[PDB]
Amino acid sequence: EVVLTQSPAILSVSPGDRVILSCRASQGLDSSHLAWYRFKRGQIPTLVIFGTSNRARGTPDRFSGSGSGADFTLTISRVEPEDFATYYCQRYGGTPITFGGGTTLDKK
Amino acid sequence: FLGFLGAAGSTMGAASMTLTVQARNLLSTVWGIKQLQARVLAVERYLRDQQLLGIWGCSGKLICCTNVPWNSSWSNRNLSEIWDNMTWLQWDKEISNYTQIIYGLLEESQNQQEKNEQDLLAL
Amino acid sequence: FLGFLGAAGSTMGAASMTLTVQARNLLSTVWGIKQLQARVLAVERYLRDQQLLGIWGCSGKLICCTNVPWNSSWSNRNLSEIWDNMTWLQWDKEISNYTQIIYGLLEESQNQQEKNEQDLLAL
Amino acid sequence: LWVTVYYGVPVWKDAETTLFCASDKHNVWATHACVPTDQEIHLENVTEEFNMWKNNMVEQMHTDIISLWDQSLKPCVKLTPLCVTLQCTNVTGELKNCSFNMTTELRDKKQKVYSLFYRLDVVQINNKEYRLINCNTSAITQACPKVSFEPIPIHYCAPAGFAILKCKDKKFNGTGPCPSVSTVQCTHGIKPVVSTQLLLNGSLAEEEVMIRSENITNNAKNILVQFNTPVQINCTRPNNNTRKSIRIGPGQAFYATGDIIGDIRQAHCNVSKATWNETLGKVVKQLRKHFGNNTIIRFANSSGGDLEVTTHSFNCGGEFFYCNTSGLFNSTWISNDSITLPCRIKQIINMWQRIGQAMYAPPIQGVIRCVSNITGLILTRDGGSTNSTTETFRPGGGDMRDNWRSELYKYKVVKIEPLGVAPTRCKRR
Amino acid sequence: LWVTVYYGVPVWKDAETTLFCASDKHNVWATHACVPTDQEIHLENVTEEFNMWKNNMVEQMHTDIISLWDQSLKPCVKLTPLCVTLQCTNVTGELKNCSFNMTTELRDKKQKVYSLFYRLDVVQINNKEYRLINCNTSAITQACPKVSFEPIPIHYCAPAGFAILKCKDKKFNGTGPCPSVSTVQCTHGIKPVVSTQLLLNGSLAEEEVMIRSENITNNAKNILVQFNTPVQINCTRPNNNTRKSIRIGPGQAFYATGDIIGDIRQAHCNVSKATWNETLGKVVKQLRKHFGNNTIIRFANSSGGDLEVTTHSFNCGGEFFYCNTSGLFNSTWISNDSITLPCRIKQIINMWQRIGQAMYAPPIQGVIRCVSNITGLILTRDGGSTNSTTETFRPGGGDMRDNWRSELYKYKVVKIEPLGVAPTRCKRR
Amino acid sequence: NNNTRKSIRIGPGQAFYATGDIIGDIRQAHCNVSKATWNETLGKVVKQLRKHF
Amino acid sequence: GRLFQSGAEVKRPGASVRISCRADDDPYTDDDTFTKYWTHWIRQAPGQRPEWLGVISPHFARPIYSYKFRDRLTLTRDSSLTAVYLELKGLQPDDSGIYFCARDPFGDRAPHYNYHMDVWGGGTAVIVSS
Ligand SMILES: *[C@@H]1O[C@H](CO)[C@@H](O[C@@H]2O[C@H](CO)[C@@H](O[C@@H]3O[C@H](CO[C@H]4O[C@H](CO)[C@@H](O)[C@H](O[C@H]5O[C@H](CO)[C@@H](O)[C@H](O)[C@@H]5O)[C@@H]4O)[C@@H](O)[C@H](O[C@H]4O[C@H](CO)[C@@H](O)[C@H](O)[C@@H]4O)[C@@H]3O)[C@H](O)[C@H]2NC(C)=O)[C@H](O)[C@H]1NC(C)=O
Ligand SMILES: *[C@@H]1O[C@H](CO)[C@@H](O[C@@H]2O[C@H](CO)[C@@H](O[C@@H]3O[C@H](CO[C@H]4O[C@H](CO)[C@@H](O)[C@H](O)[C@@H]4O)[C@@H](O)[C@H](O[C@H]4O[C@H](CO)[C@@H](O)[C@H](O)[C@@H]4O)[C@@H]3O)[C@H](O)[C@H]2NC(C)=O)[C@H](O)[C@H]1NC(C)=O
Ligand SMILES: *[C@@H]1O[C@H](CO)[C@@H](O[C@@H]2O[C@H](CO)[C@@H](O[C@@H]3O[C@H](CO[C@H]4O[C@H](CO)[C@@H](O)[C@H](O)[C@@H]4O)[C@@H](O)[C@H](O[C@H]4O[C@H](CO)[C@@H](O)[C@H](O)[C@@H]4O)[C@@H]3O)[C@H](O)[C@H]2NC(C)=O)[C@H](O)[C@H]1NC(C)=O
Ligand SMILES: *[C@@H]1O[C@H](CO)[C@@H](O[C@@H]2O[C@H](CO)[C@@H](O[C@@H]3O[C@H](CO[C@H]4O[C@H](CO)[C@@H](O)[C@H](O)[C@@H]4O)[C@@H](O)[C@H](O[C@H]4O[C@H](CO)[C@@H](O)[C@H](O)[C@@H]4O)[C@@H]3O)[C@H](O)[C@H]2NC(C)=O)[C@H](O)[C@H]1NC(C)=O
Ligand SMILES: *[C@@H]1O[C@H](CO)[C@@H](O[C@@H]2O[C@H](CO)[C@@H](O[C@@H]3O[C@H](CO[C@H]4O[C@H](CO)[C@@H](O)[C@H](O)[C@@H]4O)[C@@H](O)[C@H](O[C@H]4O[C@H](CO)[C@@H](O)[C@H](O)[C@@H]4O)[C@@H]3O)[C@H](O)[C@H]2NC(C)=O)[C@H](O)[C@H]1NC(C)=O
Ligand SMILES: *[C@@H]1O[C@H](CO)[C@@H](O[C@@H]2O[C@H](CO)[C@@H](O)[C@H](O)[C@H]2NC(C)=O)[C@H](O)[C@H]1NC(C)=O
Ligand SMILES: *[C@@H]1O[C@H](CO)[C@@H](O[C@@H]2O[C@H](CO)[C@@H](O)[C@H](O)[C@H]2NC(C)=O)[C@H](O)[C@H]1NC(C)=O
Ligand SMILES: *[C@@H]1O[C@H](CO)[C@@H](O[C@@H]2O[C@H](CO)[C@@H](O)[C@H](O)[C@H]2NC(C)=O)[C@H](O)[C@H]1NC(C)=O
Ligand SMILES: *[C@@H]1O[C@H](CO)[C@@H](O[C@@H]2O[C@H](CO)[C@@H](O)[C@H](O)[C@H]2NC(C)=O)[C@H](O)[C@H]1NC(C)=O
Ligand SMILES: *[C@@H]1O[C@H](CO)[C@@H](O[C@@H]2O[C@H](CO)[C@@H](O)[C@H](O)[C@H]2NC(C)=O)[C@H](O)[C@H]1NC(C)=O
Ligand SMILES: *[C@@H]1O[C@H](CO)[C@@H](O[C@@H]2O[C@H](CO)[C@@H](O)[C@H](O)[C@H]2NC(C)=O)[C@H](O)[C@H]1NC(C)=O
Ligand SMILES: *[C@@H]1O[C@H](CO)[C@@H](O[C@@H]2O[C@H](CO)[C@@H](O)[C@H](O)[C@H]2NC(C)=O)[C@H](O)[C@H]1NC(C)=O
Ligand SMILES: *[C@@H]1O[C@H](CO)[C@@H](O[C@@H]2O[C@H](CO)[C@@H](O)[C@H](O)[C@H]2NC(C)=O)[C@H](O)[C@H]1NC(C)=O
Ligand SMILES: *[C@@H]1O[C@H](CO)[C@@H](O[C@@H]2O[C@H](CO)[C@@H](O)[C@H](O)[C@H]2NC(C)=O)[C@H](O)[C@H]1NC(C)=O
Ligand SMILES: *[C@@H]1O[C@H](CO)[C@@H](O[C@@H]2O[C@H](CO)[C@@H](O)[C@H](O)[C@H]2NC(C)=O)[C@H](O)[C@H]1NC(C)=O
Ligand SMILES: *[C@@H]1O[C@H](CO)[C@@H](O)[C@H](O)[C@H]1NC(C)=O
Ligand SMILES: *[C@@H]1O[C@H](CO)[C@@H](O)[C@H](O)[C@H]1NC(C)=O
Ligand SMILES: *[C@@H]1O[C@H](CO)[C@@H](O)[C@H](O)[C@H]1NC(C)=O
Incomplete structure (x- = not known):
């Protein structure tokens, strides 16, 4: 079973800084199989990044993703006030689909 | 000037001086696609003949002397009675069943001359 | 005779003697237009290759020696291990990212030979 | 002696290809979509084999006329609500005054209307109760009243790499070698005149009456007769028709016959009696060259079939005529006055014999006259007892390929074979 | 060293192109409009990368089957008058005898007719009142009863400048390098057999049972099983059916079911019990190579879905069968006698899941019998709890791209790249 | 107007889209243009128009 | 675009809940989502990460269940092919949470074969209490 671990559960930043969010897998992901999702209370969830590095349709250029093997990162270049949400990684390639625990961003 | 196919009843030697006249005429809703894919027919029928001339070393030529020798197993008529008695239609009906092996011989000979010229250009 | 693409596993020197076999095979309702515009695509893919050969001064030829010198920044292997060890598919994978600059070099070299033989024929 | 390659030799073979149209208010034959016309090169010493009975241009022309006919009927009014019960009286037998209920543009409202129908278009259900003749088997479409049925001359042009050879032998029987050949890129203007038993508005033979069969000894083969001088025929529908528009749906108009203004009279055709007799004598003289001089030649009437082939069937002014x-x-x-032929009119036409399709010809307002040239015949010979000295010939037809064969008999499509090989004393250096 | 231009080198790259059809009474797949067929050249020393899961030929074949299906169904009778209330009794609950009022060819006349409908094709409205099953959401078109559903082998040929590489490795799992390659002009005859849970009338594996998945560790991926020997399956619709024609409009015939003559019985399929058990042992032996020797292999029935995928769904004889x-x-x-599977019949079919379209299959006169070959399976593995020594496999399917993936797995389209450059000691003089 | 759309099944597979209720006030549809901006643009048009007339 | 779920539910322990998901709130729509895409069902209890329940196929509505929900979950598509349904039986207080439907090509679309829950819908709050 693949377990995804997101390393800091809370992360604090100021609007306009560069932020790294990390996902660590228990084994060897395919990298077409890792996505990122923005969850905030009272809002629709949104696909941020699929396929480890591809932006979604309504996703700005401040987000990008990288990684390989079991190490995956979602980096925000300039934090905006609407980017203060929980971010989840999830893994395809076998059922059950598993999510990654979540890194919440709060402002300084 | 006789016009398009005007030398069809002329002798082969007399018809061989009108080859541009036939050559330039080979390229140019219910009535819509009838007009359409006739044009694709004419284009690919032109390009297959041009490809045949290209692989024999005869591209850009109307008359093209080759290196393949004339086998008498094809026709044993002498040169005077071919170019001054026969027409091209009679000649085609004569040698219609040797055409594919003549074509294969031309395609052999040109590729041999190509790599021979390539080898002596390395000197 | 190996047939169409039969020398694809052969060496480049052995596959260079079968170029006519690949060359002559390049030209020739739900099912209706599927049959139709495939023909237009085949004609266009043939004609842009023939235009490239005419631009480099290689029209009507299957092997065409040129004047562009082989840059060693493209591949530094010697001739015995290119023409007797590699296949054409391996060679195409090796020099795939240097191809457009070789094409531009051939395009400029032939235009300079055109202007030089034009200037030389005025004397 | 070495092989030398020539490109552009005058060599052809027989071929089949798609020909396109050229032509020098819209029409059924969409000649507005054809290309403009433009060229005739005589070919000395050429003898070419023709066969007018296996000519692929005739088959392509047939397929084209049928496709143009059903292309010009697609956007027009489908007469599905006209398949109702009619209550019909006599107008005075041949004309019925029929009253019916009809849809309107409002889906909840009906309309009591009437129309004059011909008797050939209605069948009674058992004033009396009727319905239209093809309502159980066919979807009927009304012909679009702005679209003309008048034959426009079309020209058939061959694509590049193909040529049209033309026989210029003026005594050509349509099969065998022709020794006077020309080359054209397209044919003369051929009017697609749809008729049976009599060829109308065609081309005349040059010197004598021409008799053409695929085999004159096979009596199942039709005999095409080409006249050298025309016999003119004058036809009329003398009734002054009134057209009436009925709104049968949103944007949909049915065209009815309203009143007849003046007398009720019969449609008919007139041929000059002496001219027809002189033409029949010329036909009999050309017919004795295949059956013997001492043969009695008989002309009788049609052997049977549908009304299109038991009558001389044609179209003039937009009305469809079936003349006895x-x-x-x-x-x-044995070795001033007119012949007056009565005609019946139909309005529900199934011209190409499509199962489940029929056409309603809308009524033409006014009086119709048409003056035409009989330029030929389609005959059929009766099978005899082989010990008989009489040959009976009956008017035939029904296959429209014989109509278009009588204009395309002199033409041929060939494929140009430009690449030749020969021996000379050349050698490539 | 100077550069040297070669034209006609044996070089290809991977490509997508439109393939055309060839094929060696009309059909749904219009093979009469295809090209006549004609070939295979072995390619020594060539190792080619294949992927049957990302094959564009499978996607083109899917699009072609769907387009041929809905092109075969445009000119046929729209059953929009059959959306009426039915008064239905039982025939003896699996069959209903339903009476209704129907339009005639006369717009003002009605008709009281009946038909036998299956229970799967009617829904009741609250004898009882029913209607057809897809009548609120769909336009239903009656399939055209002279058009045959029998799968005809089609061949997929590449145009000029493209080639089809064929893997000849007899133990090829459909992904990766294949070292035994040929070049063909077109594929073998591929019968488009629409089926779920069981591959019918296909091609067998050469040596052993083949197990092919895109990733056998991803249980969301289907498992294609190719048998080496076939298991024949005998299906029947034993009722002697009478077809009745109802004229519902001008030129429009609805085809009803009239009487059952003789006994009412169930449609069913028969498999040899011993042959099926032998094939399941061979499948288990090939399936233990991916999951362990001490793994318990369980076969259970379908997990859910529409009726097409919870049953073995197929067409033969013109009727559509849904077999438990x-x-x-x-x-x-762990480490003589027949299996008899009951089948239901539907007549209102929605094969490609088009929103708002359905097809009425007209009834087949007489008794239907059918002998097929089970040549393969589509399986799904249950998601395990990762502490489990049991893998459960269930019959999958429903995606017809897996039906045609099982015949196109060995094939590949490439684009010929004939223009090469290479260093030589030549120089242009 | 806050418009309500209503679907009517008028045939097999066929839906007509009706207007249902208005929710709130009935008001007129309208367009607004800035008065000074429009007047300034009309002055520019008049000045380019006096060169021809 | 978006996905339209049914309303929030309050249930007793041992009961069943039934949630709908539509791509168009028009009842007579012809949207053809659910014949092109896979639909995932994903719950989030308060204080937990999202948990995947199952996915339903576009192909003939074939469901893939999670193994821990297989005995009491049913995933259905409407016979009009324009809505999908979740049915969770035998409810317990740890079944309370926000339930989402999400739309996915799921490695099946012919050019690129990507994987992304790209359109999510709403979320039905489900409370299980007594
Ligand atoms: C069926 O499904 C299974 C399950 O997904 C597939 O198995 C996985 O396949 C993917 C294919 O992409 C594998 O990823 C590749 O892994 C190799 C090997 O990784 C090792 O070598 C690396 C050196 O290059 C090394 O860095 C790796 O270390 C990392 O990963 C381990 C976990 O394995 C982690 O613990 C470490 O801390 C590191 O994070 C590792 O030791 C690797 O070489 C590949 O990298 C290439 O590709 C990436 C992206 O394409 C690119 O960025 C790189 O530069 C490089 O070019 C790639 O990551 C994965 O390991 C497999 N996992 C398992 C569990 O098997 C299987 O392939 C499927 N089969 C089929 C037929 O589809
Ligand atoms: C096919 O069948 C249809 C029937 O469906 C025939 O149509 C009918 O034809 C008759 C005779 O032509 C028509 O009757 C005439 O109506 C005229 C107008 O009526 C006035 O009065 C009525 C009330 O009575 C008003 O509603 C109306 O608006 C008018 O103001 C009359 O004037 C006619 O009278 C005739 O006789 C007197 C002598 O008594 C003369 O002085 C008159 O001038 C006139 O000649 C007559 O009654 C009837 O209207 C038609 N019906 C329909 C529905 O059209 C077709 O004629 C028939 N066609 C053929 C070819 O047979
Ligand atoms: C064999 O060939 C002959 C000769 O070409 C054909 O005979 C002609 O047939 C057509 C159609 O039948 C006739 O044309 C029609 O004439 C009507 C009356 O024409 C006279 O009056 C007009 C003024 O009203 C004059 O201009 C004309 O010269 C005549 O003196 C017209 O009423 C018709 O109008 C139709 O066409 C117009 C065109 O715009 C439309 O707007 C109208 O709505 C309407 O549809 C039409 O013009 C022509 O008169 C005939 N010629 C002769 C000499 O009789 C035969 O038809 C043909 N035979 C066969 C079997 O094809
Ligand atoms: C689905 O549902 C339909 C109903 O809509 C059933 O159709 C009916 O079936 C019954 C029974 O099979 C039919 O009734 C039979 O009619 C025969 C003919 O009738 C004669 O007399 C009438 C006037 O009464 C005339 O109009 C007619 O022209 C005939 O001259 C009778 O002969 C039958 O009598 C039977 O019983 C006697 C014994 O008393 C025997 O001696 C006879 O030989 C015969 O067996 C009987 O009454 C009825 O006509 C059908 N209706 C219609 C509309 O078709 C379908 O059968 C049903 N299908 C299934 C599969 O369930
Ligand atoms: C897997 O593959 C098998 C074998 O290819 C298929 O089985 C065949 O299925 C077809 C149905 O499409 C069967 O053909 C039908 O047979 C009926 C009876 O045939 C017998 O009797 C006739 C004379 O009456 C003999 O000539 C014949 O050899 C048989 O002995 C016919 O009544 C059917 O007629 C239909 O087609 C004709 C064609 O002209 C039409 O005119 C008719 O109107 C009617 O539509 C038809 O011929 C065939 O018998 C089956 N073979 C076997 C061995 O069972 C499977 O269908 C296939 N499986 C799948 C899922 O595709
Ligand atoms: C048709 O054939 C005649 C007969 O051969 C040709 O007439 C000859 O023409 C050549 C010209 O090259 C003369 O040298 C001959 O003396 C002519 N012979 C006779 C008997 O007249 C005629 O030229 C041919 N026509 C065409 C167009 O080729
Ligand atoms: C496939 O590869 C083998 C191995 O190189 C080829 O066999 C060689 O063929 C050449 C002929 O040109 C001989 O000179 C060598 O001695 C052969 N080597 C061996 C080890 O047999 C073979 O010809 C290749 N096949 C094709 C079709 O190219
Ligand atoms: C309408 O016309 C028809 C056709 O002439 C008439 O039908 C004929 O009437 C005569 C009168 O005795 C009968 O002998 C014939 O048998 C009828 N013909 C047919 C085919 O049945 C009809 O009578 C006329 N109607 C009226 C009211 O006069
Ligand atoms: C047109 O419809 C009317 C109905 O408005 C028909 O008139 C009825 O005819 C029947 C006989 O079939 C009578 O019993 C009724 O009394 C008539 N009136 C009504 C109001 O129903 C009429 O027959 C239809 N046809 C024509 C040609 O008018
Ligand atoms: C057919 O109609 C034409 C008229 O179009 C008639 O020809 C006219 O006949 C009269 C008297 O013979 C001549 O004075 C005219 O000069 C002729 N021509 C024209 C244009 O009017 C012809 O008589 C008719 N034929 C028949 C058999 O009725
Ligand atoms: C067909 O020909 C016969 C015979 O010539 C015609 O019958 C003659 O008609 C006239 C005029 O009515 C009579 O005076 C004769 O007594 C009839 N018999 C004979 C033997 O001459 C008949 O009228 C012709 N039919 C047509 C339609 O022209
Ligand atoms: C027609 O067949 C149906 C199906 O068997 C019958 O419906 C069932 O009738 C039994 C009788 O007690 C009921 O218990 C079931 O609840 C019914 N099934 C359904 C789904 O409601 C029906 O009764 C039959 N009609 C007649 C007249 O026998
Ligand atoms: C399926 O049907 C076939 C017939 O098509 C059956 O095969 C026959 O079986 C009998 C007895 O075993 C043999 O004598 C015949 O030679 C077989 N072939 C034919 C063509 O008749 C087969 O038994 C059936 N299978 C099942 C499971 O019922
Ligand atoms: C599926 O398998 C089970 C277990 O093998 C079958 O249940 C048995 O059926 C037989 C025949 O009626 C009984 O004698 C046994 O008591 C049943 N139970 C067991 C535990 O063996 C079941 O019939 C099978 N189902 C199908 C459709 O084949
Ligand atoms: C048209 O609407 C725009 C808004 O789209 C209005 O522009 C705003 O005007 C206010 C007050 O002048 C400013 O504070 C905003 O910054 C403007 N922009 C936006 C994007 O809100 C404009 O006033 C309207 N024009 C008219 C004529 O009504
Ligand atoms: C060519 O052959 C013909 C036929 O035998 C003969 O008449 C003629 O003289 C020959 N010509 C020569 C130059 O030998
Ligand atoms: C040409 O060869 C073919 C071989 O099939 C033969 O039928 C034909 O008669 C030959 N023609 C001549 C003119 O010898
Ligand atoms: C060719 O150049 C490209 C540059 O985009 C590079 O990615 C690739 O690795 C190169 N290939 C080789 C064989 O060096």
């Missing part, structure tokens, strides 16, 4: 030609073929030949 | 395969997949495998 018994007064034209009633004679025996 | 609980008798086939009911077994646990």
